[PDB]
Design a protein around this nucleic acid. Structure first.
Ligand SMILES: Nc1ncnc2c1ncn2[C@H]1C[C@H](O)[C@@H](COP(=O)(O)OP(=O)(O)OP(=O)(O)O)O1
Ligand SMILES: [Ca+2]
Ligand SMILES: [Ca+2]
Ligand SMILES: [Ca+2]
Length: 341
DNA sequence: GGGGGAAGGATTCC
DNA sequence: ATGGAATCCTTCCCCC
């Protein structure tokens, strides 16, 4: 089975460059302003020009300006990048019937019933890159292999504006050479739990006794890794379906006062419902980020669909349950709707 | 013993 | 140090 993974380069930033090519060449940082103080907030992402100096996704905007004070700082326009994304996805949908849209700028393609060996995959890779570039002026990285996981890893290795093939032969080498902290789905937490287990490479999972793994990282994560290590990982590409919709906003100041939070919560609801569009949810969760950036939530599933009125009343109840079940001051507050009928 | 759910949390990642 | 969403884990619960 051959998988071709497509990942758009510094997406949010590259799009801002697209909508105003005068930006190209200069440091571009797309920010998410929390509105607590002048430049409060974090970086959604930045182009390589700015990234070469440490300015990247996740760091505070203030930390970015202290490094590249003259870089161009733009507020994140999620709706725009989303529409540009869709168009490009449709484009891909023409190279394969089998398409999995992993994120706002990622997608795996099953080109098995469309290609023989990796040579034809490579060409198709370029042919697609070219297409997208000519159609939307967007550069992307392409990764190809026997399964999704490796297809992705291939792309990571070739970023940016790259293309790479990881044939069954190299797959063997990486299962021994690849740091397992570079295996998708393995973050710092799992990384350190694997380090304390002597597993630095994928193959190291082969030594360890299963039951021991399942206990340190979990059965699912355990079986996952073992499969990859056995060169037997082989999940299929399938259409993903939006399972939840919601919004969470940062409050000007941190509160613990019901009446002070409410307005923020109601706004999260309103927008959430607009995003629902046609969807009617049976479950609603109130999510709160406490002063010490911890995340607390409370929810409830109804035996029917939830109307905006019902979400309003219930939301206030769930918030109250949070204020009385936790002592910390609430920093961010929002809602999450799920279990669509 | 074990088949569901539901709830709250933990992890990862785009 | 923003904000959106899937997945998986543990625990509690109801009951055959
Ligand atoms: N921490 C984050 N906060 C908000 N948005 C994020 C964050 N991390 C990633 N994103 C969003 C914006 C990114 O452009 C987008 C698409 O893919 P992603 O791999 O995450 O970044 P990117 O487009 O810059 O990738 P690349 O390294 O190839 O440039 O996901
Ligand atoms: Ca990308
Ligand atoms: Ca990506
Ligand atoms: Ca990692």
């Amino acid at each position: 089975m051959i998988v071709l993974f497509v990942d758009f380069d510094y997406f949010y930033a590259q799009v801002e460059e697209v909508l105003n090519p005068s930006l190209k060449g200069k440091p571009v940082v797309v920010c998410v302003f929390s509105g607590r103080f002048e430049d409060s907030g974090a970086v959604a992402t930045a182009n390589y020009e700015a990234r070469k100096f440490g300015v990247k996704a996740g760091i505070p905007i203030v930390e970015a300006k202290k490094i590249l004070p003259n870089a161009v700082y733009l507020p994140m326009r999620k709706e725009v990048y989303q529409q540009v994304s869709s168009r490009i996805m449709n484009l891909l949908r023409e190279y394969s019937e089998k398409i999995e849209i992993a994120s706002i700028d990622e997608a795996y393609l099953d080109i098995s019933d469309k290609v023989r060996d990796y040579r034809e995959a490579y060409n198709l890779g370029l042919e697609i890159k070219n297409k997208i570039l000519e159609k939307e002026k967007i550069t992307v990285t392409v990764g190809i292999s026997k399964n999704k996981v490796f297809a992705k890893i291939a792309a990571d290795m070739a970023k940016p504006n790259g293309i790479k093939v990881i044939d069954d032969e190299e797959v063997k080498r990486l299962i021994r050479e690849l740091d397992i902290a570079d295996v998708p789905g393995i973050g710092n937490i799992t990384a350190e739990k694997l380090k304390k287990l002597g597993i630095n490479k994928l193959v190291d999972t082969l030594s360890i006794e299963f039951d021991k793994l399942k206990g340190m990282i979990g059965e699912a994560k355990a079986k996952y890794l073992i499969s990859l290590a056995r060169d037997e990982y082989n999940e299929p590409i399938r259409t993903r379906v939006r399972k939840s919709i919601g919004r969470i906003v940062t409050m000007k100041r941190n509160s613990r006062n019901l009446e002070e939070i409410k307005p923020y919560l109601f706004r999260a609801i309103e927008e959430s419902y607009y995003k629902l569009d046609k969807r009617i949810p049976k479950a609603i969760h109130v999510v709160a980020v406490t002063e010490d950036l911890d995340i607390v939530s409370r929810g409830r599933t109804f035996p029917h669909g939830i109307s905006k009125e019902t979400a309003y009343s219930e939301s206030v109840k769930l918030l109250q349950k949070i204020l009385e079940e936790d002592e910390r001051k609430i920093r961010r507050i929002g809602v999450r709707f799920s279990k669509f009928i």
